[PDB]
């Protein structure tokens, strides 16, 4: 995990930041290169659906936890590790996860408070790998990642 945390950041954070800017993540991915680049269009189709079949409770969620300043995003990682690190593991838990990120996210640049993605990403990106890199090794990790998901609804 010098390289499974390194590379998962990579992913969750070029994805947080092109939902919080909109802006899409050129510049180049620096190992495996194109396995990151290949999650994170997967990570865009598969964490659109969560997040619009999600949209009510993913509101509530973002506003109990009323979410101000990086003070707020320091204390998040003790209850996302609460939630997250207790049931069955599935790639679909993990897409969530990030996917909540990404809201948070949106709601960071919505109140002029892009400086936080950064610490958030790492935050999500310790929790999954903390907790995970087991799982996420042996289900062969984000070519794993890729493969379950095979976008069958862009092609
Ligand atoms: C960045 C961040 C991410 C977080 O993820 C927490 C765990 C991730 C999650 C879960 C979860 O796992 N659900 S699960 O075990 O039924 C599951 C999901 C997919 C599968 C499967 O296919 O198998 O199963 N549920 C969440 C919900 C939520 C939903 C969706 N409905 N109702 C509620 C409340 C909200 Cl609003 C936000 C985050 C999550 C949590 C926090 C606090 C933060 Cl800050």
Redesign the pocket.
Known sequence: DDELYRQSLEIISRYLREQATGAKDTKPMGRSGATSRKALETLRRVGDGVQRN?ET??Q??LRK?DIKNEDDVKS?SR??IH??SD?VT?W??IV??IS??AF?AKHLKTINQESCIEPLAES?TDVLVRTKRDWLVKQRGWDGFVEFFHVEDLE
Do not use: D, E, Q, S
């Open positions: 999600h409770a993913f509530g969620m936890l998040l209850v996302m939630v997250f049931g599935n679909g838990r969530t996860l909540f990120g948070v999500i």
